[PDB]
Amino acid sequence: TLSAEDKAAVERSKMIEKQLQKDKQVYRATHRLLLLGADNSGKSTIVKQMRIYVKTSGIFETKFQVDKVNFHMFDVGAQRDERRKWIQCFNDVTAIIFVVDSSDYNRLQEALNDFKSIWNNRWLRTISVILFLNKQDLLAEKVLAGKSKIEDYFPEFARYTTPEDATPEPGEDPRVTRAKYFIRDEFLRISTASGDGRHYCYPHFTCSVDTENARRIFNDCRDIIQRMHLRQYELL
Amino acid sequence: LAHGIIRSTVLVIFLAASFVGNIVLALVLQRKPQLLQVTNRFIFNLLVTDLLQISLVAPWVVATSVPLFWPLNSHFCTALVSLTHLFAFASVNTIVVVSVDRYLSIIHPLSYPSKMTQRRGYLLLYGTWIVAILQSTPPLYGWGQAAFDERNALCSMIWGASPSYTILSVVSFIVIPLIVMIACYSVVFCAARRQHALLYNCKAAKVIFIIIFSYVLSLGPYCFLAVLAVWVDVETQVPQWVITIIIWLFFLQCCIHPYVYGYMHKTIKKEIQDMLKKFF
Amino acid sequence: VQLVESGGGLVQPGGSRKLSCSASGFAFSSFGMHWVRQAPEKGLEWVAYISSGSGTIYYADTVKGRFTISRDDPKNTLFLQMTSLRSEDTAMYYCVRSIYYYGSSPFDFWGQGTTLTVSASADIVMTQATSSVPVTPGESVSISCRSSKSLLHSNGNTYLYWFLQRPGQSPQLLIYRMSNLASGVPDRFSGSGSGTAFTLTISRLEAEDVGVYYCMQHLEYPLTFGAGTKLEL
Amino acid sequence: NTASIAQARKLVEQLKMEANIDRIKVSKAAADLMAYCEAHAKEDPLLTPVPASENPFR
Amino acid sequence: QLRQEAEQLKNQIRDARKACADATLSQITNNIDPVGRIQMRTRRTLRGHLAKIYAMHWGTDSRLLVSASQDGKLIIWDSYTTNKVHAIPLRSSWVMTCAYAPSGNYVACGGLDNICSIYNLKTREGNVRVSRELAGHTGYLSCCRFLDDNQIVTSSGDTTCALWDIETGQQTTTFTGHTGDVMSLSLAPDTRLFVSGACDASAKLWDVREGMCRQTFTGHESDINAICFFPNGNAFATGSDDATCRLFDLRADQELMTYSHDNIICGITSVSFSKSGRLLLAGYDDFNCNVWDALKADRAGVLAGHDNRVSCLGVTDDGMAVATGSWDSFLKIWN
Ligand SMILES: Cc1ccnc(NC(=S)Nc2cccc(C(F)(F)F)c2)c1
Ligand SMILES: Cc1ccnc(NC(=S)Nc2cccc(C(F)(F)F)c2)c1
Asked: Is domain D4-54 given the CATH code 3.30.70.2210 in the classification?
């Protein structure tokens, strides 16, 4: 039926299909994550640690490897403040890393509002968030000095008791643990007060210059995928 | 022959319902080939190995009950039994591969795609079919004989003529598959229990119990009868109704498979329900 | 873009030889390749075809059991192995490239060639009108080609090609699919046809049009060229 | 000195120059659209189903 | 002091627009026959992308169309025979738009990288290579439309449009005035003007040669996602997140018709017109496409075969078919 040249076109399309299959195999085996945070945390330093271990560019990508598994991390660059339109491209990422500077309480309500906005979103459902309470080094000094302390920023303090689950092995006095667990319970309230069964939250206590930061991401991604697979079979 | 008529009559509704179930599952699985990445091929193979069995075997078994064609060639029941055993072995091997893949996907979640490539899946499919052909071929050219019976109107295999083939068949049917099934699903149960304990600081037991129980209920009585037939006889001993129930259980597998492996998956269930609701 | 041919010389009957085609300056793996031979004082004759990815191979009926064609993509080379050389295999061989997709133009670059000398069917046929045309500069010239089959296909293509060979040079593409100009060919040339008879028109003849003109078909795999028509100034 | 007095002045100029255009009645525009739709009615295969011999996607 | 003068000018313009209205399009179009029921069924399905398809564009010859996917790929397909002519890999995986040259020799793309990359299809070597890389925008690229093989107009998320020059790489003209980021673009049939729509419920008319704003149309209550021109060239139709479509006319400087239904709550992602302007096709978020009568503003048809959100939609230059692309990574063709 086909002329002598139609068959060559068909063969060319078949070769393109074979190359596409190879690219699909390569693309299925990597994990993409989205990094988020304000110009107050050590997000740049966290990037620097993993990267060591164009004038108006829009996005930056860093690749790393843990146990022969490839991770790609994207963070936006030269972009405007409004983000309700380009946030829809990341509706199929493995996880969203969210970095919060917990040292200062002057602008913590803004961080809480940002986390709430990210949590409740039409296109960002079924996406899990890894929370990084960064710079928990200046927090202890701020609490110990006493010049500035949590007294009036939030009115529900001084009426909160540390839950009987903490493991505060590193510490000098039992007064920083209460504050940091109060901060953790703050973000944990938003995540527990909304839609559940689709996505969860994984808090951590990190400092900007830390040795074990890729392993936490590895463990949390393992947990996320295992929970999805264990829920697709009615086992959980 | 009245009894046999009742047996063959009830042996029709089951395989009329299984045909519809497997056809619906095949339609839903082939309409969107990108539903499941690699497990889609295994489920399709397990799906076709039941339609083949029903369509190509059940009419002859039905057509053996009639007394008109009661007497026949001894080289005929050597082909029917071989075909039935070929289909059963193919289904068993597919189930083993499916369970191993489930274990490899729930555990080791991250480096799963680099362990299950499209080449590794097609090679495994070819391997299951080759091993099924190898295991079902022996009874037509040597050890193992099949003959007719003038008691229950159903021609079968005489397991006592060659104990070696009986041992091989029993090992290939129950021992290895059940060992693999238990060893794979124990770790999955442990992981699910740990995850539930983390989440909430026996939903996963009813599923595993259903799977193991259904496999045993389907395949156990036939192998047990084969094992027993070496020590004592069955032509004039075991009642005609016990054999009827034993044969009935051997074919409920074709109905059980689509429910357990197609309708207990969330996405496949959702797609089937959407298609059926729309058509109706 | 460059294609260079190596091999040849003087061979005894019953021998064997190998010819190499080295390509530099273009993506060698995305093109199909052809061998085209020319007798010392005759026309051209298609010999062998190798596709892209080495998934298809075609041979002429006269060299079906004697010649072999092969590729070396990493080294960008094409090989022709010749066995039991008769006296009818003394011709100059040309290496040609061609790419096939929607809107492409096959046969758009020819090599320089190498020379080899040896000591002592239901297929379409194409006929050229005349073997010579005496004309003068500045006027218009017309050449005719005819076929024994309707080159028009069901889709809507015709598959007729016009090539020109200048004295002491290699053939170059002029017209592809009977109504399309080549990449850098002057606008003066034109082509037309009706399914069986085809005509090539030169409007304002100049000094560089002198040579031999060939038509060719590509409706089927047995490729026929014809005898050609010479122009003298 | 203040970037809020220049962006409130350029906008005023743009809005001023934007008001001096020639407008027509709505009925004329509706009639023109209806006339264009009526003149070109037998040239679009999507509206009037073309027979399954001229379209190339059959 | 300038706020009051701006308010006075806006009031004057509103009064002038109200004065010029005498009747409505519904009354005038009340006495002609309807279009009946439209039955369209898919003829071709194109597969091969890995992730969701963000855009598409038809060629001039109505046979070749180009699709862009967020896996980092452009594919040039042949429509009649379903063959694949080209597959081009990009340097950035977040591509939000793509266009095709009227000439048929080049292709454009762009995305979150703020760069507009121009690829050359007719290369001496048998490959496709990037020929130009236009930079200068300070935000993501939303749309790009091509012009006479040496000019291109691009709209960005920094609230600006730009008319470029491929030969030198510099941008020749800049169009400013929008408040929210620009999401769509349509060239005028006579390529002397073009309308743009931004994320503040406003569309604007731009003169290419002068570089100035002619008219502003505001009739929506949410951000505008799609926009195009009526074949005649004297009106345009837009789509917004308020689940309604609106028709505006340049001559009367007004809004003529609103297309909306009671059951529809989701947003509109793409809008297209028929070769004669009678029909209006719109893709919605609820996996559906709707076909409306443009004159009577009465629902006339529907479409399906899509299992996720519909992102792009386009009608061919001769009116033979319509192509649709959604987030399930499949392209469909309907007659
Ligand atoms: C004469 C006689 C004597 C003993 N039992 C029966 N069967 C009866 S009442 N119902 C029945 C019918 C079909 C199937 C079955 C099943 F085997 F599935 F239980 C049961 C009939
Ligand atoms: C209706 C009718 C009348 C007469 N004879 C038969 N066939 C019989 S009993 N056995 C039989 C059936 C099928 C195949 C063979 C085989 F040749 F393979 F041995 C044997 C059937």
From this structure: no
* Bridge partners, E280 (sequence order): E273, E292
The closest alpha carbon to E162, from E176, E150, E148, belongs to E176
Experimental method: cryo-EM
For E287, the token pair is: 């996996």
Residues after which a C–N gap over 2.5 Å breaks chain A: 53
Measured in angstroms, the CA of B199 and the nearest CA of chain A are apart by 10
Residue span of the structural domain in which C216 resides: 123-227
Phi, psi of B112, deg, nearest 5: -85, -50
Phi and psi, residue E291, nearest 5°: -115, 120
Q: Name the one residue in this structure whose structure tokens are 């889609």.
A: B40
B72 CA to middle of ligand 2, Å? 6
User: Which of D8, D26, D32 shows the shortest C-beta gap to E20?
Assistant: D26
Instruction: Give the chain C residue nearest E122 (alpha carbons).
Output: C104
Domains of chain B plus CATH, in order, are: 2-279 (1.20.1070.10)
Residues of chain D in contact with residue E21, where contact means CB-CB under 8 angstroms, are 25-26
Structure tokens at B127: 């391997």
Instruction: Give the resolution value in Å.
Output: 3.3
- Domain coordinates of chain D in residue numbers? 4-54
Query: Which ligand is closest to the CA of B2, given by its number?
Result: 1
Confirm or reject: Cβ of B69 under 6 Å from ligand 2. Answer: yes
| Ligand located closest to B6 CA | 1
Closest Cα to residue E192, out of E155, E246, E229?
Answer: E229
Residues C2 and C60 grouped into a single domain: yes
Do the Cβ atoms of E5 and E292 come closer than 8 Å?
Answer: no
Taking the C-alpha atoms of residue B91 and residue B89, their distance in angstroms, rounded to an integer, is 5
Rounded Cα–Cα distance for residues C201 and C205 (Å): 10
Collapsing DSSP to helix, strand or coil, B4 comes out as: helix
Rounded-to-integer distance, Cα A12 and Cα A19, Å: 11
Q: Does the C-beta of B66 come closer than 6 Å to ligand 2?
A: no
d(Cα E87, Cα C30) in Å, to the nearest integer? 13
Per-residue exposure over A128-144, b if at least 16 CB sit within 10 Å of its own CB, e if not: bbbbbbbbbeebbebbe
The DSSP result for chain A, as a single string, is: ---TTHHHHHHHHHHHHHHHHHHHHHHHT-EEEEEEE-TTSSHHHHHHHHHT--TT--EEEEEEESSS-EEEEEEE-S--S--TTGGGGGTT-SEEEEEEE-S-STTHHHHHHHHHHHHS-SSSTT-EEEEEEE-TTHHHHHHHH-SS-SSSS-TTTTS----TT----S-SSTTHHHHHHHHHHHHHHHHHTS--SS--EE--B--SS-S-SHHHHHHHHHHHHHHHHHHTTT--
Which among B105, B110, B192 has the least Cβ separation from residue A235? Answer: B192
* Cα distances (Å, whole numbers) of residue C72 to B268, C21, C47, E15: 48, 10, 19, 78
Q: Which amino acid is at B101?
A: D
What does each C-alpha distance from E238 to E101, E184, E256 come to in angstroms? 24, 10, 12
8-state DSSP, B110: T
User: For domain A33-231, which architecture applies?
Assistant: 3-Layer(aba) Sandwich (3.40)
Spans of all domains in chain E:
177-303
Q: Which atom of ligand 2 is nearest to the CA of B68?
A: 1
Q: How far away is chain E from the Cα of C38, in angstroms, using its nearest Cα?
A: 27
Give how many domains chain C has, as a whole number: 2
The reply to whether C111 and C216 lie within a common domain is no
CB contact under 8 A, B114 and A31: no
CA-CA distance, A67 to C193, in Å (whole number)? Answer: 68
- Residue D24: count other Cβ atoms within 10 Å of its Cβ: 13
Residue B79 CA, closest ligand 2 atom number:
18
- Contact yes or no for A201/A180 (Cβ under 8 A): no
In a domain, C232, yes or no: no
Q: Which of C184, C191, C192, C229 is nearest to C211 (CA)?
A: C229
